[PDB]
Design a protein around this ligand. Structure first.
Ligand SMILES: N[C@@H](CCC(=O)N[C@@H](CSC[C@@H](O)c1ccccc1)C(=O)NCC(=O)O)C(=O)O
Ligand SMILES: N[C@@H](CCC(=O)N[C@@H](CSC[C@@H](O)c1ccccc1)C(=O)NCC(=O)O)C(=O)O
Lengths: 217, 217
């Protein structure tokens, strides 16, 4: 089978779910539910973490036949290669590698904030820096429909998740960046993406786990 | 020649310097130096961060003619592709992606600890977890000379850095894992690596920046 294992939240699995849907993959999900405060029990996961044959047990994981893959970027690249959704030219591969890692840094900046006990005090600093962050992505995208040019590739699924999560956080944040606004709309307008988003499989919320200060519900 | 820009420390540039040396690359280093405590003045970098033509200005960066690259993994992959130092088969590419990301997680775990003011109280937790972490890498390597099999590739440069840095931190940590010990020796014994390491250009210390509680010198 093809099985995606992750917590029952958006988190690091959003881009993977969207890519599985876009590629018309035949997959099922193993959803782990963290317990409520105060214990935030992880037993649903911990009771099988070491029983799945994973080399480096973690969430998310993808099982595809005999392939057992962890690390969200490795999972995305695996699916992308399977469906010819990677950068082709050297210049495209450079952009792909820069963006995969840059978007991960941006993702981690937001996650660090949203789990920080000092969230309320720290949020203004994040918001002050947000337009500059977005400006750099806007400049890089330029006039192209997708981040690697005319063809959609896996890094667009990363880009969508990170950019759209920032819109959930600060609704107006993309408004100053026409190309980013149009990118979100173009992605959500893709046939398989809009089909997914009208279905009960779509899991836009909670953004983060039960322990988060923001995005826990 | 190419320009490699980074702080005047080991940090995220160790694997890149080693890969540049292994590939006989012509390069010069632009070395930045941080100020002292408590402010850790970054002016030497910040005063030219936006004057270098980088799309997402950061350290490390690599300038190779028209190619201007940030994100350490992107720099490594760029050099690796140029010299056929990447996984070839699907299984090799999956291993490569898992390890690139897994080693980054390990790297960040040690850096998070060593930069934490509460270093002393937090150290036992890291050290107790270390054997498990290394066991997983040892199991994955098995009897192979290199992490992707019989061919050395860029992920070996990442592996060497992360494993050897842990040996600096905890001198005995690889002793229980003969294949990891032997891997370190094999990497260090490559002609071009050995020549570099025995030269004055090799920069094993400081491990981290001036802000670190451990490895700041
Ligand atoms: N670099 C890895 C990070 C993987 C990771 O941090 N995984 C977290 C859940 S997501 C990170 C974050 O969204 C999250 C969600 C829910 C709980 C904790 C953290 C996890 O629960 N791993 C299993 C384990 O440690 O046993 C990756 O990209 O896959
Ligand atoms: N994901 C990125 C991380 C890049 C990064 O965190 N770079 C740090 C110095 S290294 C991280 C670490 O070794 C370090 C070194 C020195 C000081 C603090 C931290 C930096 O100083 N960037 C310049 C900037 O943000 O303007 C990468 O892999 O290249």
């Amino acid at each position: 089978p093809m099985t995606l294992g992750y917590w029952n939240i958006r988190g690091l699995a959003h881009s993977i779910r969207l890519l599985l849907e876009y590629t018309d993959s035949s997959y099922e999900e193993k959803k782990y539910t963290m317990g409520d405060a105060p214990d935030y029990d992880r037993s649903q996961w911990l009771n099988e973490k070491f029983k799945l044959g994973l080399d480096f047990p973690n969430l998310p994981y993808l099982i595809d036949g005999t392939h057992k893959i962890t690390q969200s970027n490795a999972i995305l690249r695996y699916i992308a290669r399977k469906h010819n959704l990677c950068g082709e030219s050297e210049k495209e591969q450079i952009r792909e590698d820069i963006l995969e890692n840059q978007f991960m840094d941006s993702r981690m900046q937001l996650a660090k904030l949203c789990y920080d006990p000092d969230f309320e005090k720290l949020k203004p600093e994040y918001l002050q820096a947000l337009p500059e962050m977005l400006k750099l992505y806007s400049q890089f995208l330029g006039k192209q429909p997708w981040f690697l040019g005319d063809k959609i590739t896996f890094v667009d699924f990363i880009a969508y998740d990170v950019l759209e999560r920032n819109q959930v956080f600060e609704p107006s944040c993309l408004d100053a960046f026409p190309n980013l606004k149009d990118f979100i709309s173009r992605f959500e307008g893709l046939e398989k993406i809009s089909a997914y988003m009208k279905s009960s499989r779509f899991l836009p919320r909670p953004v983060f786990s039960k322990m988060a200060v923001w995005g826990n519900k």
